[PDB]
Each structure stands twice: as C-alpha cells, then as structure tokens.
Design an enzyme around this catalytic site. Structure first.
Site, short mmCIF file in Angstrom:
data_model
loop_
_atom_site.label_atom_id
_atom_site.label_comp_id
_atom_site.label_asym_id
_atom_site.label_seq_id
_atom_site.Cartn_x
_atom_site.Cartn_y
_atom_site.Cartn_z
CB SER A 53 40.28 29.28 46.05
OG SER A 53 41.53 28.39 46.72
CG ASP A 104 42.75 34.04 26.96
OD1 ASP A 104 42.62 33.39 28.08
OD2 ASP A 104 42.36 35.18 26.13
#
Ligand SMILES: Cc1cc(C(=O)Nc2ccncc2)c(C)o1
Length: 330
Positions: free
Chosen positions: A199, A35
């Site tokens: 992004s 994770d």
C-alpha cells in the site's frame, strides 16, 4: 468457464464469511470459509473426532461415488490466530457457483482445535493463497483456483465482501457492474506464498494522506485490519477514550463514539473504509467498551488487509503468470 457464488457473514459482526461448496457425487454442500491467506481445502468429515464436531455439516467420503483416498497423504495446519486442524486426504469433485474441478484434494479433518468446534457455522476452509503453502505431505496439492485456472475464461477470481450483508466470489471473470470508477492494479510478491502487496499510505478521517509504503497481505480469512503500530496509534488517537488494553488484547473504544473512516492507498488510488466498518461491538455482552477493527500487527510479523479493509473494495486476485491485485471502490 466461470463460477459465481454468494458469500454470507456468519454473524452480526462479519467475523467471517461462508460460501456454499458442492463436494462429491451426489453433491454434499458444505459452507466453507474462503481464505486468501492459506492454501488448504479442508472439511469437517465423518472422520472428525466426534467430540470435536458441534453442529457443522460433515463430508462423508464413503457416500461419494467420485471420492478416492489419496493414499499415504496427510495434512496439518496452524493458522496465525493459533487455531489448527489435521487429517488425511481424498480427491473428489468440487464445485463452486457452477465451476467444477475434478480431482480436487479435499482434506478430511480427523482433529480440529476448539475454535473450529465452537463455530457451528463454518464447515471447513477453502484456501486461495498460492499452492506453495499447501500442507499436504508427502505430495503437496493444488488449490481449487490453481486447479480451475486453465479452464477459466480469465485466470482471476474476485472478492466482493459485504458490510453486514452478503457479497460474491466470482471465478474467471470481472463483473464490471460490481464496482464504481476504475480498478487500480498493484504488484504482488508470491515469495511468502501470499497475495502480498505494498500500500502507498493512509489517512485517518478527513486528515491528510500520509505517503508511506506498507507491505501486507490481502487475506479474506482474517477478520480485522492489522497495520504497523505507528499507523494504528494515529488512528485511535482520533477517538476520544480509545486505548490499547493488554487484558482485552488490543484497542478498545467507548461504544458511544463515532469512529472516523480510514483510507488506504493503492497506487495513486484510495480506498475508504467507513468508520462503522471498524466497530466490532461490545467486548462482552452489555459492555460499553467496544472492540476496534484496526489493530496492531506488531508481533504478527506481517501486516494483514483482512475483511475490514477488503469489504470496502471490489478486489481482483489476478492469477496470471505474473500475479497482481486490483482494487476498486464500490
Ligand atoms: C475464533 C476463531 C478463529 C477461527 C478461524 O477460522 N481462524 C482463521 C484464521 C485465519 N485464517 C483462517 C482461519 C475460527 C473458526 O474461530
């Protein structure tokens, strides 16, 4: 040193991925959910409340000659999805894919929430976010990666998740045969303890690319792709009959649909998520309403590039002094 381990979907939907991990002496192999959005290595154990264990493999520290109670230490974690666990702490030897760390904090669960109990395939979590998020008190502990880092050939790990197939976590090296083209690296902020990056935009299907900054985290422990409501609405508007259902808890779409791809930007590069990766199947057995793999992050407070996005790429988690993230197509 290096390590290399195969990671395997837990079910036919790729809800999560499990990776075998050796703990203790002699080794006890548990299948952990790696994770990159959390920083605790915790396991089902001989200390876990019996009624909360249902099929998981447990760690028994009393059977490990290298286990030592970390006296006075406790831990307690709550994840974004409302699941939780807590307990006490041992140090022991932990190996992943041939890479061994001695003195790793292994957090033994005394209590786990129902979602964990109900998932017989996941024996615990191995956190790979920054150690500043580790919940052990009163002495915060380091992640497996942080402990390993100095010994690694290169201070990196990579995630290569499969679509409906196994993939690989590598530690200490970049497998240049595992991706196509070049890896594009992008800046990371560690201020919230995550692999947080920005992004450069998105496209829906064959549509034009929208240049827009989307801050979010690379999180292997989250199944879906959670993005701003504007972006998600633009995606689902291209699917006839798709709608946001408050009763189901997100966007659903007719199972008869063919989904468009979704592209996200990494600098001047582009990662394309095929439409099929966005299909999470019937909301309940026999239903013709299917659950979408792209959902709104509104209310979460952060955008999350979870498995839906990451599985479309070869992803480098570069833990150099100034961390960065790399993405390549594959
Ligand atoms: C329904 C469900 C969610 C989870 C689960 O592992 N969550 C989770 C979320 C974020 N990061 C790590 C873990 C389980 C076992 O069942």
């Amino acid at each position: 040193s290096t390590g290399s381990a195969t990671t395997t979907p837990i079910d036919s939907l790729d809800d999560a991925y499990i990776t075998p991990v050796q703990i203790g002496t002699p080794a006890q192999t548990l299948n952990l959910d790696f994770d990159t959005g959390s920083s605790d290595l915790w396991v089902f154990s001989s200390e876990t409340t019996a009624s909360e264990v249902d099929g998981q493999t447990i760690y028994t520290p009393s059977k490990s000659t290298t286990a030592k109670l970390l006296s006075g230490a406790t831990w307690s974690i709550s994840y974004g999805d409302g699941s939780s666990s807590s307990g006490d702490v041992y140090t022991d030897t932990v190996s992943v894919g041939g890479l061994t760390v001695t003195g790793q904090a292994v957090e033994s669960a005394k209590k786990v929430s129902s979602s964990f109990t109900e998932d017989s395939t996941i024996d615990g979590l191995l956190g790979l976010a920054f150690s500043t998020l580790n919940t052990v008190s009163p002495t915060q502990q380091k992640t497996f990666f942080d402990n390993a880092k100095a010994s690694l050939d290169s201070p990196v790990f990579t995630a290569d998740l499969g679509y409906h197939a196994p993939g690989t976590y590598n530690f200490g090296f970049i497998d240049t045969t595992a991706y196509t083209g070049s890896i594009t690296y992008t800046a990371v902020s560690t201020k919230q303890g995550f692999w947080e990056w920005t992004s450069t935009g998105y496209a829906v299907g064959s549509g034009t690319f929208k240049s827009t900054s989307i801050d979010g985290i690379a999180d292997t422990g989250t199944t879906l792709l959670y993005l701003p409501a504007t972006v998600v609405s633009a995606y689902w508007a291209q699917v006839s009959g798709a709608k946001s259902s408050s009763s189901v808890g997100g966007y659903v779409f007719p199972c008869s649909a063919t989904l468009p791809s979704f592209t996200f930007g990494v600098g001047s590069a582009r990662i394309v998520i095929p439409g099929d990766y966005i299909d999470f199947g019937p909301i309940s057995t026999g239903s013709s309403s299917c659950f979408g793999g792209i959902q709104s992050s509104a209310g979460i407070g952060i955008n999350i590039f979870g498995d839906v996005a990451l599985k479309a790429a070869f992803v480098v988690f570069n833990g150099a002094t100034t961390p960065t993230l790399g993405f390549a197509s594959k």
